């Protein structure tokens, strides 16, 4: 529980209903319950897990950035309320990251043998350590290196086992490049990774169906957008 008494199929069905209703907290709770049934997740189910928690922590991060900005302005010679409330949101955010990292560690990653499932989960692990790094203040260094390590393992597998146009490989590369730029203070590594990823994908588009082409080029455009921003 609290999802322990519901059928796995019903949890998945309700996660999809929650997505339609834009009820992402519910969606995440349903997907947590589905994961905790102990069976591996399908491709579509992995996407549902990603969508649910990404939206939840997305709201929390946006709120945290608002409050952090206000707190920063408050400094530079009122009361403790701004800091308290930022800490409240921060704690809640960390709790969600810890929850997702918990699911990945118990036991999604260890049972994921196929390249695309394994890369998917390791990319997710990198992301949630990155979100923890965004608010960390030297616990921070170990957090950053945990993000790096997860991204790196995912990169190694994806380069060996997936085509350069694979959307999971592309999405991993885009986020690892964002990690380099935003977290690791390595803009040159960020730019290099983004460019090589984009160029290697470009060269492989000719192999793709119209639908696969659409999928890949969409993410390539986001890579390009970041490069334009960075240079």
């Amino acid at each position: 529980g609290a999802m322990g008494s519901m059928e796995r199929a019903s949890l998945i069905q309700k996660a999809k209903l929650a997505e339609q209703a834009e009820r992402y907290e519910d969606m995440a709770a349903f997907m947590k319950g589905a994961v905790e049934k102990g069976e591996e997740l399908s491709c579509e189910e992995r996407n549902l897990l990603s969508v649910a928690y990404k939206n939840v922590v997305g709201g929390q991060r946006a709120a945290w950035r608002v409050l952090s900005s206000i707190e920063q302005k408050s400094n530079e010679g009122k009361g403790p309320e701004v800091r308290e409330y930022r800490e409240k949101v921060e704690t809640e955010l960390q709790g969600v990251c810890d929850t997702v990292l918990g699911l990945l560690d118990s036991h999604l990653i260890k049972e994921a043998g196929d390249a695309e499932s394994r890369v998917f989960y390791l990319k997710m692990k990198g992301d949630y350590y990155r979100y923890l790094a965004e608010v960390a203040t030297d616990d921070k260094k170990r957090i950053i290196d945990s993000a790096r390590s997860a991204y790196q393992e995912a990169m190694d597998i994806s380069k060996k086992e997936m085509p350069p146009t694979n959307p999971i490989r592309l999405g991993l590369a885009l986020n690892f490049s964002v990690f380099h730029y935003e977290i690791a203070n390595s803009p040159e590594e960020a730019i290099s990774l983004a460019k090589t990823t984009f160029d290697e994908a470009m060269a492989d588009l000719h192999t793709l169906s119209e639908d696969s082409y659409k999928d890949s080029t969409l993410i390539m455009q986001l890579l390009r957008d970041n490069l334009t921003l960075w240079t």
């Binding site: 969508v51 950035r65 957008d225």
Partner: peptide, 7 residues
């Protein structure tokens, strides 16, 4: 904030 990958 550099945009990360949506979804």
């Amino acid at each position: 904030r550099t945009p990360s990958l949506p979804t």
